[PDB]
Amino acid sequence: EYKLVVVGAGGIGKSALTIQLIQNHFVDEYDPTIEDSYRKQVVIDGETCLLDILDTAGQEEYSAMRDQYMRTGEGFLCVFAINNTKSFEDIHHYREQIKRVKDSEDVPMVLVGNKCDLPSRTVDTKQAQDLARSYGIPFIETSAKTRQGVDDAFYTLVREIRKHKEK
Numbered sequence: 001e002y003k004l005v006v007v008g009a010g011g012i013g014k015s016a017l018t019i020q021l022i023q024n025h026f027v028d029e030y031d032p033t034i035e036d037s038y039r040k041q042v043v044i045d046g047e048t049c050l051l052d053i054l055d056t057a058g059q060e061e062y063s064a065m066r067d068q069y070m071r072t073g074e075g076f077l078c079v080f081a082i083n084n085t086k087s088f089e090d091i092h093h094y095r096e097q098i099k100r101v102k103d104s105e106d107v108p109m110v111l112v113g114n115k116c117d118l119p120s121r122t123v124d125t126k127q128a129q130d131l132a133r134s135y136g137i138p139f140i141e142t143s144a145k146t147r148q149g150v151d152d153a154f155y156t157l158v159r160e161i162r163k164h165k166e167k
């Protein structure tokens, strides 16, 4: 199973994106070794995927689990909101923490600019493309409200993980 982690500042749509992905892609699978014989699973681009959201503020200011999410995750959606400059400024620290915890210079990641439906844009596409280029990763704009780009962001992350697992 591919282990995907959605990371970013609070209030940017991480939960909204993940819920929309599950809604579109969950299936009920027959498994007679499980108690009730059926389990829900998310399948993305033919791969069974596990999904987790990493917040560090709010209730998660009190959590002991940040580094554990980073060690377990195999690929990361690094999310900001296009109407939240601070959330964009927060990206670098998240990426640096992931790289430090995983002790790897090759961590599958996709940069995601959410809320692209909103007219109040303070982070330009070019700013985000430049950041993604520096990191060597894809950038995609999404809206959980209108659904634009949501599947594409996760499908792209799955391909990034697949390439990493190949070699």
Ligand SMILES: Nc1nc2c(ncn2[C@@H]2O[C@H](COP(=O)(O)OP(=O)(O)O)[C@@H](O)[C@H]2O)c(=O)[nH]1
Residues within 6 Å of the ligand: 009, 010, 011, 012, 013, 014, 015, 016, 017, 114, 115, 116, 117, 118, 142, 143, 144, 145, 146
């Ligand atoms: N306009 C708009 N609002 C969104 C979008 N995604 C999330 N929201 C709203 O942003 C707020 C925070 O979303 P949430 O999923 O709780 O963010 P989280 O803290 O990152 O998990 C909620 O009121 C959502 O309805 C989006 O793409 N567009």
